[PDB]
Design a protein around this ligand. Structure first.
Ligand code: A1IAH
Lengths: 154, 153
């Protein structure tokens, strides 16, 4: 039981590393790090509902859009956290690059990310991205809501 | 290695204590921190953390916290140990009334990630990450809609 958990964690960590270092045209094949039914996407959206991309096929299709709209994206300051679950990892990192959304001026997008990676039989079953949507608003020139702080201790 | 398994199990108990601190006990949650410990919210409208530095300042802030989030509870608490015996992550939900100065009383629910870093068996740094748009909604603040034209479905 202990030897099986150690084996899984060691392999899964390599996948997380590979995912976090996937850039450029290699992003078009990042979906191959997922199970056939694997899920990825963005869990912190302005609507409050995740943008959940379900299945390898849809993940591969999403990658075309991702490379179009974030053409030079890099993850930086990557800190990988193993957990007591050999099939569950967290990653804290930064991300930055151009944001190219039709209808908006080209922007420079920087954000602070937490990634959740859950594994099944050596591949990613569920990837979830958590960031601050306000920094994406900023990158697109969208006015950011403000919480008035006058009444708050400072 | 012995210090490590022991530090981790000790710190896990602190994380459990923190996440289950409710009601008037929130007035003493700051005692779980180092004297110079930091706690705060890392996901805000400014893009910068709003942090409270110092155990005693954290205790003073608890008064405001109990006023503005009077019935707050963390639920669906998932505690993650890591390879660093002094670093924990928690995934959870949180909800309760929100009574924010200058805004109508509301109900606030969010999804949270907490980071806990330990020093000498007390919390040196607590950081919470959530989606600020859900807090905006709870306060009646309009949230803009990002158009992702062509996003595959
Ligand atoms: C002070 C930090 C640690 C904190 C703790 C709990 C809730 C909040 C919070 O809810 C927000 C603000 C705030 C600032 C100073 C205070 O003394 C009390 C609260 S300002 C703000 C702006 C946002 O966009 C989202 C949340 C908050 C902060």
């Amino acid at each position: 039981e202990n030897r099986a958990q150690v084996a899984a964690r060691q392999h899964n960590r390599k996948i997380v590393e590979q995912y976090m270092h996937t850039r450029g045209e290699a992003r078009l094949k990042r979906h191959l790090l997922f199970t056939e039914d694997g899920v990825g996407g963005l869990w912190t959206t302005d609507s409050g509902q995740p943008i959940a991309i379900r299945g390898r096929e849809k993940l591969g299709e999403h990658a075309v859009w991702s490379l179009q709209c974030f053409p030079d994206w890099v993850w930086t300051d990557i800190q990988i956290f193993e957990t007591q679950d050999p099939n569950w990892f967290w990653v804290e990192c930064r991300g930055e690059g151009a944001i190219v959304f039709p209808g908006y001026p080209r922007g420079q997008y920087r954000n602070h990310f937490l990634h959740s990676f859950r594994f099944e039989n050596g591949l990613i079953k569920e990837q979830r991205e958590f960031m601050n949507p306000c920094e994406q608003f900023r990158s697109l020139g969208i006015e950011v809501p403000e919480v008035r702080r006058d009444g708050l201790p400072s």
